Design an enzyme around this catalytic site. Structure first.
Site, PDB file in Angstrom:
ATOM      1  N   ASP A   1       0.782  -1.227   0.000  1.00 37.30           N
ATOM      2  CA  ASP A   1       0.000   0.000   0.000  1.00 37.30           C
ATOM      3  C   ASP A   1       0.818   1.283   0.000  1.00 37.30           C
ATOM      4  O   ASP A   1       1.389   1.657   1.020  1.00 37.30           O
ATOM      5  CB  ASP A   1      -0.940  -0.022   1.210  1.00 37.30           C
ATOM      6  CG  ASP A   1      -1.776   1.230   1.323  1.00 37.30           C
ATOM      7  OD1 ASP A   1      -2.064   1.845   0.275  1.00 37.30           O
ATOM      8  OD2 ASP A   1      -2.162   1.587   2.457  1.00 37.30           O
TER       9      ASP A   1
ATOM     10  N   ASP B   1      -1.896   5.677  -5.202  1.00 33.02           N
ATOM     11  CA  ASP B   1      -2.209   4.785  -4.089  1.00 33.02           C
ATOM     12  C   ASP B   1      -2.567   3.356  -4.498  1.00 33.02           C
ATOM     13  O   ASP B   1      -3.683   3.091  -4.948  1.00 33.02           O
ATOM     14  CB  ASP B   1      -3.361   5.445  -3.318  1.00 33.02           C
ATOM     15  CG  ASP B   1      -3.794   4.676  -2.089  1.00 33.02           C
ATOM     16  OD1 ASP B   1      -3.180   3.650  -1.734  1.00 33.02           O
ATOM     17  OD2 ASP B   1      -4.777   5.133  -1.468  1.00 33.02           O
TER      18      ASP B   1
HETATM   19  C1  LIG Z   1     -12.690   4.078  -1.175  1.00 32.18           C
HETATM   20  N1  LIG Z   1     -12.049   2.990  -1.965  1.00 32.18           N
HETATM   21  C2  LIG Z   1     -11.212   2.062  -1.352  1.00 32.18           C
HETATM   22  C3  LIG Z   1     -10.277   2.524  -0.358  1.00 32.18           C
HETATM   23  C4  LIG Z   1      -9.380   1.640   0.304  1.00 32.18           C
HETATM   24  C5  LIG Z   1      -8.477   2.199   1.322  1.00 32.18           C
HETATM   25  O1  LIG Z   1      -8.847   2.976   2.212  1.00 32.18           O
HETATM   26  N2  LIG Z   1      -7.202   1.799   1.207  1.00 32.18           N
HETATM   27  C6  LIG Z   1      -6.188   2.047   2.238  1.00 32.18           C
HETATM   28  C7  LIG Z   1      -5.457   0.727   2.530  1.00 32.18           C
HETATM   29  C8  LIG Z   1      -6.422  -0.389   2.894  1.00 32.18           C
HETATM   30  C9  LIG Z   1      -6.196  -1.646   2.203  1.00 32.18           C
HETATM   31  C10 LIG Z   1      -7.065  -2.777   2.464  1.00 32.18           C
HETATM   32  C11 LIG Z   1      -8.164  -2.581   3.402  1.00 32.18           C
HETATM   33  C12 LIG Z   1      -8.407  -1.346   4.114  1.00 32.18           C
HETATM   34  C13 LIG Z   1      -7.523  -0.225   3.865  1.00 32.18           C
HETATM   35  C14 LIG Z   1      -5.203   3.114   1.718  1.00 32.18           C
HETATM   36  O2  LIG Z   1      -4.237   3.246   2.625  1.00 32.18           O
HETATM   37  C15 LIG Z   1      -5.942   4.446   1.512  1.00 32.18           C
HETATM   38  N3  LIG Z   1      -5.171   5.590   1.137  1.00 32.18           N
HETATM   39  C16 LIG Z   1      -5.232   6.871   1.657  1.00 32.18           C
HETATM   40  C17 LIG Z   1      -4.988   8.169   0.935  1.00 32.18           C
HETATM   41  C18 LIG Z   1      -6.093   7.336   0.466  1.00 32.18           C
HETATM   42  C19 LIG Z   1      -9.405   0.242  -0.035  1.00 32.18           C
HETATM   43  C20 LIG Z   1     -10.320  -0.282  -1.021  1.00 32.18           C
HETATM   44  C21 LIG Z   1     -10.445  -1.727  -1.369  1.00 32.18           C
HETATM   45  O3  LIG Z   1     -11.549  -2.202  -1.634  1.00 32.18           O
HETATM   46  C22 LIG Z   1      -9.286  -2.627  -1.400  1.00 32.18           C
HETATM   47  C23 LIG Z   1      -9.522  -3.965  -0.863  1.00 32.18           C
HETATM   48  C24 LIG Z   1      -8.397  -4.862  -0.689  1.00 32.18           C
HETATM   49  C25 LIG Z   1      -7.080  -4.379  -1.059  1.00 32.18           C
HETATM   50  C26 LIG Z   1      -6.852  -3.115  -1.736  1.00 32.18           C
HETATM   51  C27 LIG Z   1      -7.981  -2.229  -1.913  1.00 32.18           C
HETATM   52  C28 LIG Z   1     -11.214   0.642  -1.658  1.00 32.18           C
HETATM   53  S1  LIG Z   1     -12.627   2.801  -3.480  1.00 32.18           S
HETATM   54  C29 LIG Z   1     -14.112   1.803  -3.362  1.00 32.18           C
HETATM   55  O4  LIG Z   1     -13.002   4.089  -3.954  1.00 32.18           O
HETATM   56  O5  LIG Z   1     -11.684   2.050  -4.239  1.00 32.18           O
END
Ligand SMILES: CN(c1cc(C(=O)N[C@@H](Cc2ccccc2)[C@H](O)CNC2CC2)cc(C(=O)c2ccccc2)c1)S(C)(=O)=O
EC number: 3.4.23.46
Length: 373
Positions: free
Chosen positions: A38, A221
């Site tokens: 991440d 990201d």
């Molecule tokens: C809001 N969105 C979103 C945000 C996030 C999310 O918050 N990811 C965090 C790590 C994070 C990783 C895994 C779980 C929680 C947080 C990142 O550190 C966020 N970054 C901060 C500046 C943005 C994850 C997903 C996701 O579904 C996902 C699942 C598994 C692995 C990778 C991504 C989708 S969206 C729907 O618009 O795409």
């Protein structure tokens, strides 16, 4: 047949479209876990207690090299959050650099909507800078530790292959991309902040002040699935995409990501959807370049019917160039030179008529004003 960084190639995996993870071994004796990569956060954390969605977890009592830092840590993300305890331990990446370092590790003990059922990962590797680390910037991120303790160059690159990929640490592998690498400045070292100076849908300029594209900020990201855009930019982008794909109509909910549309097995008319281009500030004054993705990147599959979700969504915290953007390119996080490179990915999904692209240079004036202050 070989290659300097060849052993790091294909070191990423991903079950379904639930992130990309790399194996990391912590403690002594060895405890290997699947860790989500991440670039959107800066904490290295691993499940450390049983959880319904975890097949395995970090057992500190079994690691003789574990050192308790006697401090709690809480990390909320756009999606989900977890609570844990800080400490340090030995950490190596079997299919990464040939070194071992002592890094900070947050042992996750409680969590809410963080771990995902069937994702196959048990932790997260925050690759961003100390500025956004929790509890504060004094908690050195993993990559910072790696660079300070070893000879590994301060640079890593990612090739996320959609429907795992490669994370080259300490360098670049030329087999992961075609064409040339184009670089955009890392505006400030906290998130991997960049500056978008122009947006086009099928070659047509969205015609918005570039300040709107970076309103608040724009970041790269790997931990976020979608291409998230500021409210106003999202509304304008959707209107243009709809106009460009007018050959067929879709419900409003589809564009909002609330409704899915499925096509007969292997019949998705990618040709009816437009390509999307983001122009990024270049390394020379008044020079920019653009990256272009296809519907194969922004229309993501869902578990003889191929169902898809429109993966461009709204944000109130700036533009987030997530997996939707990264899956079309080989992205080089050149921390040493404070820049991020983009090149057409050798593994990106495309068809016989179109391909993702990285082209330049272009002339864009007053790019400095696009940034939010
Ligand atoms: C809001 N969105 C979103 C945000 C996030 C999310 O918050 N990811 C965090 C790590 C994070 C990783 C895994 C779980 C929680 C947080 C990142 O550190 C966020 N970054 C901060 C500046 C943005 C994850 C997903 C996701 O579904 C996902 C699942 C598994 C692995 C990778 C991504 C989708 S969206 C729907 O618009 O795409």
């Amino acid at each position: 047949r070989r290659g300097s960084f060849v052993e790091m190639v294909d070191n990423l995996r991903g079950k379904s479209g639930q992130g990309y993870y790399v194996e990391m071994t912590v403690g002594s004796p060895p405890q290997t876990l699947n860790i989500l990569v991440d670039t959107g956060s800066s904490n290295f954390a691993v499940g450390a207690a049983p959880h319904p969605f975890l097949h395995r977890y970090y057992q500190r009592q079994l690691s003789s090299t574990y050192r308790d830092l006697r401090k709690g840590v809480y990390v909320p993300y756009t999606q989900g959050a977890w609570a844990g305890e800080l400490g340090t331990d030995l950490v190596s990446i079997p299919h990464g650099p040939n070194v071992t370092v002592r890094a900070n590790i947050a042992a996750i003990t409680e969590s809410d909507k963080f771990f995902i059922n069937g994702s196959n990962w048990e932790g997260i590797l925050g690759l961003a800078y100390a500025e956004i680390a929790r509890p504060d910037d004094s908690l050195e991120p993993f990559f910072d530790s790696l660079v300070k303790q070893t000879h590994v160059p301060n640079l890593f690159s990612l090739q996320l292959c959609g429907a795992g990929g490669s994370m080259i640490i300490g360098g670049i592998d030329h087999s992961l991309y075609t064409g040339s690498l184009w670089y955009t400045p890392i505006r400030r070292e906290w998130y991997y902040e960049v500056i978008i100076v122009r947006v086009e849908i099928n070659g047509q300029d969205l015609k918005m002040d570039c300040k709107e594209y970076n309103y608040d900020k724009s970041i790269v990201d790997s931990g976020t699935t979608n291409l998230r855009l500021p409210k106003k930019v999202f509304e304008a982008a959707v209107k243009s995409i709809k106009a460009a794909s007018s050959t067929e109509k879709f419900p409003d909910g589809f564009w909002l990501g609330e409704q899915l549309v499925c096509w007969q097995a292997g019949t998705t008319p990618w040709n009816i959807f437009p390509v999307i281009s983001l122009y990024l500030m270049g390394e020379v004054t008044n020079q920019s370049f653009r990256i272009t993705i296809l519907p194969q990147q922004y229309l993501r599959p869902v578990e003889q019917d191929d169902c898809y979700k429109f993966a461009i969504s709204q944000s109130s915290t700036g533009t987030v160039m997530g997996a939707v953007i990264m899956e079309g390119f080989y992205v080089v996080f050149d921390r040493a030179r404070k820049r991020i490179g983009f090149a057409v990915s050798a593994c990106h999904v495309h068809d016989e008529f179109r391909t993702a692209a990285v082209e330049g240079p272009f002339v864009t004036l007053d790019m400095e004003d696009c940034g939010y202050n």
